[PDB]
Design a protein around this ligand. Structure first.
Ligand code: NAD
Ligand code: NAD
Ligand code: GTP
Ligand code: GTP
Ligand code: ATP
Ligand code: ATP
Ligand code: ATP
Ligand code: IMP
Ligand code: IMP
Lengths: 14, 488, 488, 14
């Protein structure tokens, strides 16, 4: 869909 | 495995402090294990609605209108319709694109049966076509009477006798009309068994609504990536300003049913735009807004906290901008797409790069840096369905192209320039080359999807490299006497 | 009245011996009592066949073949097809222009209903239409059965499965037909009141002898002056050489039915031309020939009494011609078209002018110096109907252009060059601009017909004036930084 | 027509 579709998975990890 | 560390990852590249542009770095290739067509370049525009292709036009008066809207709608993207006009004008053309019925041709003209034939004589050359339906009162909301054609009114020398159209054409006796809500190929079957070149459609109450043309059904190409909504109308957005009277614009637009709006400005971190997001997000909760323009993470934060759903990144890097030459603001936007999208992925917000694009390489380097979709203004200018019309100059076919802050659009200041760019043809022939450009680029990068090429960039296994000026003179065409550069 | 003698008449202006060309002199105006549409420009091509416009095409391999031949004959002009090809090629293209419009279509292509629909596919690939008749035996001399048109085969995926022509055709009885022994006016009134498109012609015994089309009448009202003969086809011409094997080229054109033929040469006054005209006038007495090139009256004499029916003048004076530079022969064009015409009107022989025409004003000056029609080489090339195809170079779209005397068209010498010239669009929107310019020039001169302007020239009424070099660089565009000229 | 259509009328007058 959409929120997955930028990067996917855990997706930030500072 | 081993994977030697030759290259620069993105947080190593864009922390050296230099302002990098698109033709200043490039992407190292990697392992490929799939063929060219089967990479699916599905990208997002906002927090809810997604696209098949990551292209999207820019909202200027000179690039995007209803034709550009329908075209980029059906070829995968969206277009945004400018606000350089009256509100009812923009509402009228967003209503023109929003229905469109995919090839069932829209806005027919109509005559009364009392009407004469010099009017259809002038309207044949005013518009171009010949087949016109007729109702009782000569308007769309009336019971059907019949149809005319140039096979009906050609060779009659009685045109000044106040001709009455009941005594001319075929009313109901040879008439065939399909039942309403009929599909493309089934109605096409009705035409091709009917041996008749024009087909009205009526409801249960005999009201003409829509209409076809026969010659279009010889090349009714299906567009499999068409980007149309839950009620199967095309995704199509618009853009409105920030000055207070645009409330009367956007409520008319929401009456017309616009689903994404863009709040364009030179730089978007105003109280005006933040208060207008606060004005929108309590009145139209299903409507989704595009904020902009932002180049830094600070004005990215100060918009996304308000409730905006996607950022439009990049000021001062237009093809027709002079706001770095005048307002001394902006930043080189290949740094801006990274340092805004790095903040924008924290909150689940897609970002939209605009300007600086003049080839299909730059859109690949843009959306590999974290951009979800790419707004193009000059590269999609000088096409067939761009507004305005062609004029030859120096022997080169071109049509004019002009910026919103350029005072040929508007004491005030100038933030743009007016000019012209040579032609490109219609974009049904042009943007599949752009899709193939993304497709071969993400081929050699080594990712099966744009979502995972951004996932490869933020992870670190996708690695960039700096490029110097004496390497940029070497990257293009060099050491030839005369070259001819044909992209497709 | 008084009418002061301000100016120089033609016989005063061309016996000075100066090598005057078109853009070296110009025409003084006179009295006006009419409009631009009111003047006709029906001119003569040969001693017997006349044209509605004086604009004929050139016989080169890069300006005219059947495409510009039909497209210019539809305008009112005429087309010659170059002899730089195999004779069967020039034969089937001169049939193709002699086709594509008939009235009473004698012996069309027709089939028997036993064959399949896959065959009419390559028949349309060989003819370009699908409005085909069907007879019982198969050939034209057979009993009428039915017809099918372009509107029947839009739903067959099967190429030969259930594709027998018997079960898909309109019956014989519900075909609007007309008996034989009919002329064409009540035939096309039956056709236009049928609203059915085609009209078979039969005898009392249902034997199909002819067929009528409707696109003929579409072209009739779309092209109201289009130079058609007694059998109502487009008149056409063809180029031949002058060697001995060209006798086999000419009779192939003669069975094809060409109406005029031009003797292409670098220098007309040969034994070869007068011998082949003597070879023609006993074999084809109704066929009329064009003989050239001539530039002086002394070689006009021994062509007119040989039997040449119109003269094709001008050597050394083309856009791609260099024979003044290599062979050092010829003369300037305007003093040629004055003196050859002034000799030729003694014997009632029309005269057509070649070369040097760059714009509309050269056509008006050529027609004012006694020429009957005007032949244009580079001004007509690089159009939509020119043969070859477009190609880019530095972004200006253009088309290659190349003469016979250029060695690329062939130890021989070169009398021409091969080059290129930019596009001027299709001619259906271009040569009406030339007709409008000619008739505006005849308006400013003061003659409501080209017969009248040539009578005013030879009578001494229409008088000219010499123009110097500084005066002719004053005539165009000057004294400004930049400009673009749009003509039509 | 062409015998008339070139000049018309007198047509030479030496
Ligand atoms: N690279 C880019 O993306 C870029 C850069 C410059 C300009 N532009 C385009 O050119 C246009 C000009 O930008 P603009 O925002 O300055 O023009 P504008 O008409 O939208 O606003 C004019 C300026 O007045 C102020 N403003 C905003 N709302 C106001 C309000 N209610 N009352 C008083 N002042 C208000 C702002 O400073 C604004 O810049 C824009 O439409 C923009 O799309 C684009
Ligand atoms: N401004 C002009 O109109 C112009 C000027 C120069 C050349 N051209 C073009 O150049 C083309 C070819 O040049 P060309 O006219 O010299 O070709 P051509 O057909 O006349 O033959 C070339 C030479 O053969 C000679 N010739 C004629 N009949 C012959 C025969 N039976 N046997 C042997 N030789 C014979 C001719 O005298 C000529 O010198 C021409 O088709 C013409 O269109 C045009
Ligand atoms: N089927 C057919 N009919 C024609 C064509 N051209 C003209 N007609 C019509 O046939 C009629 C007979 O022609 P004429 O009256 O003898 O001569 P004309 O009217 O000067 O010829 P046009 O200018 O072509 O109309 C014309 O009035 C035309 O209306 C044609 O090409 N095909
Ligand atoms: N249909 C048809 N046209 C012919 C024939 N012979 C010559 N023509 C000429 O070729 C021209 C082109 O034919 P068109 O009628 O335009 O072909 P189309 O567009 O498919 O339309 P229809 O054939 O009438 O269905 C006609 O106008 C005729 O003047 C023939 O046998 N059949
Ligand atoms: N009622 C109509 N309303 C609007 N446009 C029409 C209409 N009918 C035809 N057209 C437009 O004109 C284009 C060409 O369609 P079409 O050629 O079949 O019409 P036509 O009546 O047959 O005119 P013509 O006789 O010139 O062919 C269509 O793609 C369509 O855009
Ligand atoms: N729904 C229809 N209902 C009634 N008559 C029709 C219908 N469709 C076609 N026709 C009739 O048959 C004729 C054929 O229509 P057609 O579309 O072929 O003509 P056109 O619009 O002028 O375009 P063209 O002449 O180029 O074919 C019409 O004049 C009309 O009389
Ligand atoms: N004299 C005629 N009388 C009755 N019906 C005819 C006649 N001529 C053609 N038709 C019928 O009308 C149908 C359509 O033929 P038509 O002449 O209209 O094709 P067309 O419109 O010229 O093709 P296109 O649109 O490519 O120009 C035919 O299949 C045939 O059944
Ligand atoms: O008038 C202007 N002044 C400065 N930038 C503009 C103006 N009008 C449009 N732009 C920007 O230029 C972009 C067009 O991209 P480009 O023309 O391909 O460089 C738009 O998306 C806007 O962000
Ligand atoms: O190859 C050639 N060498 C010299 N003259 C030519 C040649 N081919 C055609 N011509 C002449 O040049 C005319 C066209 O010249 P233009 O109208 O000035 O382009 C033709 O009608 C011919 O008479």
């Amino acid at each position: 869909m959409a929120d997955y579709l930028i990067s996917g998975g855990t997706s930030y990890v500072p | 495995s081993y994977v030697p560390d030759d290259g620069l990852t993105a947080q190593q590249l864009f922390n050296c402090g230099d302002g990098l542009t698109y033709n200043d770095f490039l992407i190292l290739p990697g392992y490929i294990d799939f063929t060219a067509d089967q990479v699916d370049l599905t990208s997002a525009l906002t927090k809810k609605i997604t696209l098949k292709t990551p292209l999207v036009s820019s909202p200027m008066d000179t690039v995007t209108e209803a034709g550009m809207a329908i075209a980029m709608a059906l070829t995968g993207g969206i277009g945004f319709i400018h606000h350089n006009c009256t509100p009812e004008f923009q509402a009228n053309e967003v209503r023109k694109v929003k229905k469109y019925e995919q090839g069932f041709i829209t806005d027919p003209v109509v005559l009364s049966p009392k009407d004469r034939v010099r009017d259809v004589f002038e309207a044949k050359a005013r518009h171009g076509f010949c087949g016109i339906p007729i109702t009782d009162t000569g308007r769309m909301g009336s019971r059907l009477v019949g149809i005319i054609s140039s096979r009906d009114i050609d060779f009659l020398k009685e045109e000044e006798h106040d001709c009455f159209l009941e005594e001319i054409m075929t009313k109901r006796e040879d008439l065939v009309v399909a039942p309403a809500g009929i599909t493309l190929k089934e109605a096409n079957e009705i035409l091709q068994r009917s041996k008749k070149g024009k087909l009205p459609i009526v409801n249960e109450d005999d009201e003409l609504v829509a209409i076809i043309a026969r010659t279009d059904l010889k090349k009714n190409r299906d567009y499999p990536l068409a980007s149309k909504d839950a009620k199967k109308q095309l995704l199509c957005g618009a853009a409105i300003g920030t000055h207070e009277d645009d409330k009367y614009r956007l409520d008319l637009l929401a009456q017309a049913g616009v689903d994404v709006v863009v709040l364009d400005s030179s730089q978007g971190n105003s109280i005006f735009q933040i208060n207008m997001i606060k004005y929108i997000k309590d009145k139209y909760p299903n409507l989704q807004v595009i904020g902009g323009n932002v180049v830094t993470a600070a004005q990215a934060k100060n918009l996304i906290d308000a409730g905006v759903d996607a950022l439009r990144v990049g000021m001062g890097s237009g093809s027709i901008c002079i706001t770095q030459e005048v307002l001394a603001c902006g930043r080189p936007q290949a740094t801006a797409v990274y340092k805004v999208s790095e903040y924008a992925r924290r909150f689940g917000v897609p970002v939209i790069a605009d300007g600086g694009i003049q080839n299909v390489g730059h859109i690949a380097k843009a959306l590999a840096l974290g951009a979800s979709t790419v707004m193009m203004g000059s590269l999609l200018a000088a096409t067939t369905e761009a507004p305005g019309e062609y004029f030859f100059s120096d022997g080169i076919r071109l049509k004019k192209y002009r910026g919103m802050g350029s005072l040929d659009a508007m004491i005030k200041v100038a933030q743009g320039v007016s000019g012209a760019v040579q032609d490109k043809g219609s974009i049904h022939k042009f943007v599949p080359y752009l899709i193939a450009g993304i497709q071969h680029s993400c081929q050699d990068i080594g990712a099966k999807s744009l979502t995972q090429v951004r996932a490869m960039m933020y992870s670190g296994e996708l690695k960039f490299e700096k490029r110097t000026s004496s390497a940029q003179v070497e990257g293009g065409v060099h050491s030839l006497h005369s070259y001819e550069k044909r992209l497709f």
